[PDB]
Amino acid sequence: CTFYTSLSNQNQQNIFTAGRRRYMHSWDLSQTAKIEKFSRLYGHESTQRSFEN
Amino acid sequence: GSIKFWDFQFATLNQSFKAHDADVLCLTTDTDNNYVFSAGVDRKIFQFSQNTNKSQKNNRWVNSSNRLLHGNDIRAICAYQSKGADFLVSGGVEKTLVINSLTSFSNGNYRKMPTVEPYSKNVLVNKEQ
Amino acid sequence: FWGATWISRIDFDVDFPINGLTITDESNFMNHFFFTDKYKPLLFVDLISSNELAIIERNQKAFIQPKLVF
Amino acid sequence: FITSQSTQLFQLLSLVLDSIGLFSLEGALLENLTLYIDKQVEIAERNTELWNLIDTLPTYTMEYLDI
Amino acid sequence: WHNVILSNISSNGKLLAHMCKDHKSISVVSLFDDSVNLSFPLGSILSSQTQSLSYNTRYVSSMAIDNMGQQLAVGFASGVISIVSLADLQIRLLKWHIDSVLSLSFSHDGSYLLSGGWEKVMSLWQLETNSQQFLPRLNGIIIDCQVLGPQGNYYSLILQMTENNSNSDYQFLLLNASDLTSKLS
Amino acid sequence: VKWCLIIHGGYLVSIPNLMSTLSSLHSTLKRRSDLLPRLLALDARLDCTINKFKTL
Amino acid sequence: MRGSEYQGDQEHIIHNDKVRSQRRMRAFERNINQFKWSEALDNAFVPGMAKELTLTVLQELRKRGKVRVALYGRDESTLEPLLNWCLKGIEDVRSASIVADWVAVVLELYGNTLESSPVLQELMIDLKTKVRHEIHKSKEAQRIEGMLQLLT
Amino acid sequence: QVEIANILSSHLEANSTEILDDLMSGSWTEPEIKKFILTKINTVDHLSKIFLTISKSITQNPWNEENLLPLWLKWLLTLKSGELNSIKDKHTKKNCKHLKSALRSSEEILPVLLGIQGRLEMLRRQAKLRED
RNA sequence: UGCGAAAGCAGUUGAAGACAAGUGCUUGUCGUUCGUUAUAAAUGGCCU
């Protein structure tokens, strides 16, 4: 897992986490959490069977 | 069924195209290496083009088009160009040649030669008996 | 006269009415009337008798590429 | 009169046989009525079949050339 | 301009591409400058086999112009898409839609193309490898498609629901590009 | 079934309710009869093709 | 590897997105989903296939409007499995209506092939015998229905 | 049988109004009707004339006990269906509509008759029991 | 297309202009008009 801050828009803060799974999570930044899942590779799924690294 | 373009000096992959649905049995290119033509078991001929100047500067190929012309596998393909000639000749398990134009492959007309052209006769008939 | 896909007959005592995928051939090669295309392809054509014509004609799994039908 | 748009007349007949009941009807007349109906059923079957119908190389060949 | 059959404006809002009967000719013009000024007959783009076939193959239903003006996508009622390189009028065929394509839109960078038609499926064509990604089972056929964001965060769609013949039922769908989920319907 | 109706017909007439108690017969008989028009349509078509190749 | 057992009992926010596993789809369903009309028809007539499951794929294909589409590229070798089921399916009340439609199309679509194929003809002779038998059963059910009205 | 076939052939060429009477001759049998249609009806005009005559007759009285005209129509349809629909005459389509309307009535008749036929069977059986 | 029940009962599908192809003539077309109630077919099928 790792923090991320957009180099232009400093107000944009995000956390990316991944595991031995075919999807990756992103957490934009407190009642709830805005979590998005990246699970689409656009035709290149064969080369990528895990997002862990 | 993939066509891959490798950088020679570094021996590294530049592009990968998943074009064919089966084996790619033969490849050919035009004189200027502006076009790459591939054919195989799927009976299709794919055209990969780098003719545009922007493509040439970036060194990127584009899957321009494909055509279905053969009734069976395409084992052999070759290209020829001169000031008065522009041929893309293909043949295979169908046992017949197919002739196209390299520059106008997408839109140009094509000819399917006869399977047998009896220049040398294999049959004779005797009027008597 | 006959070819791979055509048969023709010419009478040599009558004169006719005057009225892309190949080399353009700018360079040199070196250095009464009956026409039919009904019969094709032809292996061999010749006469058996004065009125009998012999026309001999030709009579594998492939990768399936479906044609859409609605 | 029958044994001598028609469904509305026959459907009216089927109502009659229901009104008459089993006890009342007489055998000899039942024979004549049965024969007529069997003829009609055959005709109705025949017409229906018509109605549905309305809705519904050699190795060697010898030929003469046209010259 | 006279006798404008079809008209489109780039995502930037700085280029206008239009087709006229002056059969037909396509011309692209920059709005705020004189840098871009091009015109060419539709016959040059159209294929010869297309000329042999029915009128559906020669009839355009959609037209999209890239921000830089280097590419122009033409959709046809037959379901074929043709990307034209404006520099040399070179054509590239993308053929997935079985019926008329109704909406086309380039991405901001120009490396992706959103297409939609009667299939009720939104297709993202990856032009680098000619691949595609799908978002099927939308509520209706895609009248219009567009990329909405500085980084293409959102996709805006217009759906038609052609089942109801009595009235045209439009629905505006704003999807999150990250996971393609309806941010606002 | 046919003999039950013939013999016990008088008794069956004088019953307070028949539909509820004989509901199974009505459903079963109703189902078969509803197929009758379709089967005639199939039979006519089968005869048409059967006649054709038999004479040819 | 000691963290799998944890279910987030002590955490602030618990986030669940995993989609529950749907049952595996059968071969005929996958072919329909992929628009394989002809192959889906083949999966209908395979050994050890449930009668109800065979009726659905035939009803789905009709509902999709693909009855001729599934039947174009066929000959006597691959047509007999459909006719074999039709021979037994005509008897049942549930599948009688579907059999009538499918048998109608193959006749209207393979009249010529029927003439030159003796095996296909025999399938029609016995089929005509069976449909004729159903006519007797349906006609009787009308008669018992007719007299059953007399009682009430 | 040969004399009637030749007479019918002449009347078809002669456009006689006696075509109907020729078709109603009792000498006709089923195989001869097949033979006459296959061998003698080589022109579309003759095919149209016979169809028009039969269709008009059956339309007027679809319930005629005489089965012969239906047998002609049945085999005329079964054997020459390709040539019949090739005929594009508007009246021929109209005559087909009138015939279809008359025949369409009959199939509606049938479920009622089977109901009546069922009751009569139950009635006869009861009488036999009372006799015994 | 009108009416009606779902079955069906009546009634329609014309003219001009322009374009393309073939040879002034023929056919086919219309992001052209007026009037009347009035086959298809660019190998092209749905994500994770």
Short mmCIF file of all heavy atoms in Angstrom, two decimals, chain D residues 17-18 21-22 45, chain G residues 132 135 139 149-150:
data_model
loop_
_atom_site.label_atom_id
_atom_site.label_comp_id
_atom_site.label_asym_id
_atom_site.label_seq_id
_atom_site.Cartn_x
_atom_site.Cartn_y
_atom_site.Cartn_z
N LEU D 17 -79.50 -30.92 -26.72
CA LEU D 17 -79.23 -32.25 -26.18
C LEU D 17 -78.96 -32.19 -24.69
O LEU D 17 -79.27 -33.14 -23.95
CB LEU D 17 -78.06 -32.90 -26.92
CG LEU D 17 -78.19 -33.03 -28.44
CD1 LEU D 17 -76.83 -33.35 -29.05
CD2 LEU D 17 -79.20 -34.09 -28.82
N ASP D 18 -78.38 -31.09 -24.21
CA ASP D 18 -78.18 -30.92 -22.78
C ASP D 18 -79.52 -30.72 -22.06
O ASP D 18 -79.73 -31.26 -20.97
CB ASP D 18 -77.25 -29.75 -22.51
CG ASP D 18 -75.83 -30.01 -22.99
OD1 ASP D 18 -75.64 -30.97 -23.77
OD2 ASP D 18 -74.92 -29.26 -22.59
N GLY D 21 -81.62 -34.20 -21.91
CA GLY D 21 -81.16 -35.15 -20.91
C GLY D 21 -81.07 -36.56 -21.46
O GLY D 21 -81.47 -36.87 -22.58
N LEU D 22 -80.51 -37.44 -20.63
CA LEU D 22 -80.29 -38.82 -21.04
C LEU D 22 -81.61 -39.58 -21.14
O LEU D 22 -81.86 -40.29 -22.13
CB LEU D 22 -79.35 -39.53 -20.06
CG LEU D 22 -78.03 -38.83 -19.72
CD1 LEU D 22 -78.11 -38.06 -18.41
CD2 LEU D 22 -76.90 -39.84 -19.68
N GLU D 45 -63.28 -32.11 -40.60
CA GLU D 45 -61.88 -32.53 -40.67
C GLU D 45 -61.31 -32.31 -42.07
O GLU D 45 -60.18 -31.83 -42.21
CB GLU D 45 -61.77 -34.01 -40.29
CG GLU D 45 -60.44 -34.39 -39.68
CD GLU D 45 -60.43 -35.81 -39.16
OE1 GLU D 45 -61.47 -36.49 -39.27
OE2 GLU D 45 -59.39 -36.24 -38.63
N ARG G 132 -50.59 -38.47 -35.71
CA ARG G 132 -51.93 -38.98 -35.94
C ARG G 132 -52.48 -39.63 -34.68
O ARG G 132 -53.69 -39.56 -34.41
CB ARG G 132 -51.91 -39.98 -37.10
CG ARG G 132 -53.26 -40.61 -37.43
CD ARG G 132 -54.27 -39.58 -37.92
NE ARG G 132 -53.84 -38.93 -39.15
CZ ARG G 132 -54.47 -37.91 -39.72
NH1 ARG G 132 -55.56 -37.39 -39.19
NH2 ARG G 132 -53.99 -37.40 -40.85
N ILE G 135 -53.69 -36.94 -32.43
CA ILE G 135 -54.98 -36.43 -32.87
C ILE G 135 -56.11 -37.23 -32.25
O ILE G 135 -57.14 -36.68 -31.84
CB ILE G 135 -55.06 -36.44 -34.41
CG1 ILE G 135 -54.15 -35.38 -35.03
CG2 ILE G 135 -56.50 -36.23 -34.87
CD1 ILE G 135 -54.48 -33.94 -34.65
N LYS G 139 -58.74 -35.61 -29.71
CA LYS G 139 -60.15 -35.69 -30.09
C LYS G 139 -60.97 -36.37 -29.00
O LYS G 139 -62.09 -35.93 -28.70
CB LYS G 139 -60.29 -36.44 -31.41
CG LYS G 139 -59.94 -35.61 -32.63
CD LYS G 139 -59.98 -36.45 -33.88
CE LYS G 139 -59.78 -35.61 -35.13
NZ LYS G 139 -59.57 -36.46 -36.32
N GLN G 149 -69.79 -31.96 -19.93
CA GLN G 149 -70.67 -30.80 -19.89
C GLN G 149 -72.13 -31.21 -19.78
O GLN G 149 -72.93 -30.51 -19.15
CB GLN G 149 -70.46 -29.93 -21.14
CG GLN G 149 -69.11 -29.24 -21.19
CD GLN G 149 -68.83 -28.61 -22.54
OE1 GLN G 149 -69.63 -28.73 -23.47
NE2 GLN G 149 -67.70 -27.93 -22.65
N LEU G 150 -72.49 -32.34 -20.38
CA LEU G 150 -73.87 -32.81 -20.31
C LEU G 150 -74.28 -33.09 -18.87
O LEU G 150 -75.41 -32.79 -18.47
CB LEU G 150 -74.04 -34.07 -21.18
CG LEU G 150 -75.37 -34.82 -21.13
CD1 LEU G 150 -76.52 -33.86 -21.25
CD2 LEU G 150 -75.42 -35.85 -22.25
#
